[PDB]
Design a protein around this ligand. Structure first.
Ligand SMILES: [Cl-]
Ligand SMILES: [Cl-]
Ligand SMILES: [Cl-]
Lengths: 126, 126, 126
C-alpha cells in the first residue's frame, strides 16, 4: 500500500503541506482544486465562470498525471463561496465531465482558501 | 476497476450531472442526499425532522440498490444548514443506523443546494 | 469486507452515533476530530492554536489504534470555524505531518459541532 505523490507541472504547484493528489491501492485522492493558473500563480479570473473552468481543467491535469482520467472519477465534492453560483458552476462542471456522472456532494462554504469562489476535490480510480 | 452507476427508483432521481452513487472496487460512493421525496420531487417537509428522516431513508434506498446496506456504511459526512439543528439531526441519524456506528464528520454549511436543511453523503462497502 | 471499529482510549471518546474510525478493505476512515482532550472531555483550550494541536494529536492516536500512522494518511479534509485561522492552522498541521504531504481540502464552515474552531477528518491506509 504504497503512496505515490502526484505532481503535475500543469496544475497549480503544491509547495506547502499537501500534494496535488495521492495514489493508493488503485485509487487517486485529489486535493480540492481552486482556480489558480499554474502559469501565473494567480486566479484565472475574478468570476465564477473563470474560476470554475480553471478548477475543472486543473482536476483533469492532476488526474492525467496520476494515470487516471475524468471518466474514472467516482465521486466529487464541490464547494462554493456563494450558493447562488450553483447553477453556473454546475453547467461548467457538466461540460467538463461530458456524459460521465460521478457521485457528488455540493455546498456553500462560509469561505474558501485565498478567497476562491469554488473548490472541487475528487476520488478516482486508476 | 469498472464503475457502475446506481439509480434507485425509490431515491430522488439523478437527472443532471451526477449519479446517486457509483460502485468501484468493492466500495459504494454515495452522493449527498437531500430530503426530496422521489414521488413529488419536492422536500418531504419544511422542517429539519422531516427532511432528516427523508435523507436517511433516501440513503438506505441508494445503498440497497447498490448491493450494500446501512450496516455496511463506513463513513458519513453530515451537512446542516444550521448548526442548531445538530441535536435533532443526530437523533434521527442514530435511529436510522440503529447500533451501527460509521465514522463521521459534521458541520454547518453556509447554504445547501435547493435550500435544503440537511445533506448526508457516505461511503460503504459491498 | 469486514468493518472494524477503532476506539483509542487516548482520543476523545465516541459514545454517541459514530466511531472514531472504521477499518475496511485496507483503509482507515477517520471521523472529523475536534480539539477535545479525552482526559477532560473539554476543549484543550479556547484558541485556534490549542485546538489545532489537540486535533492533530487526536488524529495520530486514532491512526495508531487502527494500525496506521500519520505517514499513511492519503487525504485530509480541514474544516475551520473562521477562514482567518487558515495560516496558523496550516502551520500546526504541517508540524504534525512533518515531511508527509497528504492530499487535502480545506474550507471555513458556517459552524462546527460544539463550537469547535477546527475539525480534521482523514483517510489512511493500513
Ligand atoms: Cl470527493
Ligand atoms: Cl462521506
Ligand atoms: Cl478526508
Amino acid at each position: 500500500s504504497k503512496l505515490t505523490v502526484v505532481a503535475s507541472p500543469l496544475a497549480p504547484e503544491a509547495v506547502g503541506a499537501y500534494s496535488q493528489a495521492i495514489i493508493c491501492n488503485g485509487m487517486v485522492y485529489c486535493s480540492g482544486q481552486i482556480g489558480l493558473d499554474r502559469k501565473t500563480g494567480d486566479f484565472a479570473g475574478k468570476t465564477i465562470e473563470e474560476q470554475s473552468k480553471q478548477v475543472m481543467t486543473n482536476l483533469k491535469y492532476v488526474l492525467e498525471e496520476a494515470g487516471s482520467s475524468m471518466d474514472k472519477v467516482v465521486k466529487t465534492t464541490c464547494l462554493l463561496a456563494d450558493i447562488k453560483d450553483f447553477g453556473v458552476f454546475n453547467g461548467i462542471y457538466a461540460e467538463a465531465f461530458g456524459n460521465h456522472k460521478p457521485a457528488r456532494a455540493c455546498f456553500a462554504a462560509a469561505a474558501l482558501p485565498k478567497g476562491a469562489l469554488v473548490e472541487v476535490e475528487c476520488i478516482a480510480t486508476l
